[PDB]
Design an enzyme around this catalytic site. Structure first.
Site, PDB file in Angstrom:
ATOM      1  N   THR A  42       8.338  -7.686   5.070  1.00 18.77           N
ATOM      2  CA  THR A  42       9.039  -7.880   3.807  1.00 18.77           C
ATOM      3  C   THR A  42       9.533  -9.319   3.677  1.00 18.77           C
ATOM      4  O   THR A  42       9.648  -9.844   2.569  1.00 18.77           O
ATOM      5  CB  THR A  42      10.228  -6.914   3.676  1.00 18.77           C
TER       6      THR A  42
ATOM      7  N   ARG B 263       7.375  -4.543  14.035  1.00 23.99           N
ATOM      8  CA  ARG B 263       7.715  -3.998  15.345  1.00 23.99           C
ATOM      9  C   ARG B 263       7.282  -2.544  15.493  1.00 23.99           C
ATOM     10  O   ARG B 263       6.794  -1.925  14.547  1.00 23.99           O
ATOM     11  CB  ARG B 263       9.223  -4.112  15.593  1.00 23.99           C
TER      12      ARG B 263
ATOM     13  N   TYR C   5      12.831  11.545   1.256  1.00 22.38           N
ATOM     14  CA  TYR C   5      11.840  11.173   2.259  1.00 22.38           C
ATOM     15  C   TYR C   5      10.843  12.306   2.478  1.00 22.38           C
ATOM     16  O   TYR C   5       9.652  12.068   2.686  1.00 22.38           O
ATOM     17  CB  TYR C   5      12.523  10.811   3.579  1.00 22.38           C
TER      18      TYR C   5
ATOM     19  N   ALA D 175       4.144  -4.447   9.993  1.00 20.98           N
ATOM     20  CA  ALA D 175       3.658  -4.620  11.360  1.00 20.98           C
ATOM     21  C   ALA D 175       4.618  -5.471  12.183  1.00 20.98           C
ATOM     22  O   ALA D 175       4.216  -6.111  13.154  1.00 20.98           O
ATOM     23  CB  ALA D 175       2.278  -5.251  11.347  1.00 20.98           C
TER      24      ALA D 175
ATOM     25  N   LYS E  50       6.846  12.131   1.939  1.00 17.40           N
ATOM     26  CA  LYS E  50       5.980  12.482   3.060  1.00 17.40           C
ATOM     27  C   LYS E  50       4.945  13.522   2.642  1.00 17.40           C
ATOM     28  O   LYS E  50       3.754  13.372   2.915  1.00 17.40           O
ATOM     29  CB  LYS E  50       6.818  13.010   4.231  1.00 17.40           C
TER      30      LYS E  50
END
Lengths: 209, 205, 213, 205
Positions: free
Chosen positions: D37, D15, D143, D13, D147
């Site tokens: 992180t 940005r 990725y 959270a 997904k």
């Protein structure tokens, strides 16, 4: 037409779908290499394959094993033209009763393995300007995640190596009740030269589910 | 596989994909019947078909036309075992500038025709415990609607007649025609008996 | 978000989902115009709508009809900002046992209607740089084809009028109670979300409300 | 509707989307816990959250971290009602040029993390008989696999825990505020019977 002068790797070819695939490819002129999890399984594969192929032992999660099996193939036969992934397993459990071991084992065996085996044979396939990659995907949040990952992987890769004469597809059996003979027919069609312009596809063989 | 003593009706077989499909079927033993919009086009189909079939004129929007040609097929050849719908058209336009004529003509020609022709050959197929129905679906809200409808129709019908030994599929190119024929010939063969309600995309990535 | 100062046309708002949708928009400030096939139905719609809207008779298969009601709406209320198509019907039959009419009625009522109603309200929406088109799509080859076509129509049109400030979507309920998939109220909640200002960049979507089946 | 009396956990959270999601939830009454992180990120999250929440450090691949963060949440606030997964990363490379390190980093961070976090909050959600799990999914074979897996996972889990008052969905972006609006709707009481869905926010692509 026929697979005269084509080498095919069929992971998990001990019985059922895997065997039916291997047997149908050989009948159409292919030199087929089937694998099993045990040496005992491999010998059984070498038996019904005869001299039209050979049975190897493969641990699709072990990188050391993947290198050994392919090296054996490149030494004694040649570069793989066709890859059939059918070494999937299951560890059913409701989310809360599913341990990390059971989740990660499926991801490694059913999904990650497809990335490894594809990567290892991609070099040779591009050099020949020909290649076939086909994956057999039929409380199961782990199996479902892997099954879905394989499809997302194949479609992405299918676009990535489209120009090079390589196709990447998935066959989805029903698992009247299905027949392994017809799943093989589906795989054989895709692997042939009549499915060159078919790639990134999920061919379902379920009889209208 | 060979088609041996089977009869195949290919709508829109004048050129391109429809022709490729028709030519590949006779090459594998099928008795093929191609269709055109004009009598002039029909003979051109008969020309390359030769002794292996015949080329007729059919107006897929006209029920009478569907009935008469089918009667002609039964009369001179027999019952249709394989139906290949490839008689689609386009009337592109933005929604605002699209007439009711331009919408309704697409629906009648691209969607409703598949319903009529499917129903017309379905009864004979179930008598024979064998059948194949394959539809070629390649400002286009009118074309887009019909294309989707055909898929919904095929998937629904496939589920309805599955165990009667009939499959209903769609081949969707990214419009080589020869590769389209190879896909259509695969679904129509005895090698794709357990593939039904499927949309086979031929785009190559 | 609210719908104050908006005009919403809900076809087939007599009962169930159609009514549930209509009621929920009104409660959130919308001027809602509900539709029925019969005059009797239209009076019943005007009754529960009160002075927050009105009920009219519309035959989505009749072009002359569609023009008449839309003319009435523009005269007595104004330009339609939100269109919800829910005037679908079913004429179930095995393909073999399906008369042409039964096929063609479904195509005309469930598919072609959406093209005509969308076309009839699109001019105004582009001028206002805002529009909402939502279609309700839940031995049925005729019903299945039309519903598939609606989604095909929606996705194509959504891409066509995207930057004009107009969205075109489909809400797909699992069959609802007239465990359970949902109820008329919850389909209305979905339709209200897509029609709001919080779904401006959601377009060409098929929102399924089956609750995981 | 408002989220008064709800605790929301929004991974990543710091940005953009993550923050946009977090900021919209607190505005509607939720007590939001956004993660980063790094601690410096966590303090930054705690800053814009004010008294309406808190920012913690989280390593979504580390089980020990996941146990500690959740323990902190239950200690100081309570059980999680809403879970928003936005801790995804990317390691782009062609298949030949993708090393096993790059592949497994994505699988662990983008897919397996969702399995771990979902399981950790499932006990309390079923106890409350209410729950919301929403996952953000926007050469990339690694990725793409992650997904797709998330969606396969979400559809499978959604079906498993449907009647338990829990919904498991996916939001698929192509403004971060509008991604928040979609996430807010699914987490609200107006999407109680929307589950196992993939809500696309792209403008039609």
């Amino acid at each position: 037409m026929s697979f005269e002068g084509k080498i095919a790797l069929v992971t998990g070819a001990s019985r059922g779908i895997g065997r039916a695939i291997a047997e149908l490819l050989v009948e159409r002129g292919a030199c087929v290499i089937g694998t099993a999890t045990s040496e005992k399984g491999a010998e059984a594969i070498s038996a019904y394959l005869g001299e039209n192929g050979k049975g190897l032992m493969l641990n699709v999660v072990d990188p050391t094993s993947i290198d050994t099996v392919l090296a054996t193939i490149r030494a004694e036969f040649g570069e793989v033209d066709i890859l059939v992934n059918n070494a999937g397993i299951t560890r059913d459990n409701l989310l809360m009763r599913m341990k990390d071991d059971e989740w990660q084992d499926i991801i490694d065996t059913n999904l990650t393995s497809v990335f490894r085996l594809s990567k290892a044979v991609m070099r040779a396939m591009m050099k020949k300007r020909f290649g076939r990659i086909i994956t057999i995907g039929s409380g199961q949040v782990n199996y479902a995640a892997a099954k879905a990952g394989v499809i997302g992987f194949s479609k992405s890769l299918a676009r990535e190596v489209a120009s090079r004469g390589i196709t990447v597809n998935v066959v989805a059996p029903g698992f009247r009740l299905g027949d392994a003979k017809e799943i093989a027919s589906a795989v054989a069609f895709l692997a042939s030269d009549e499915a060159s312009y078919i790639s990134g596809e999920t061919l379902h063989v379920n009889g209208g589910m």
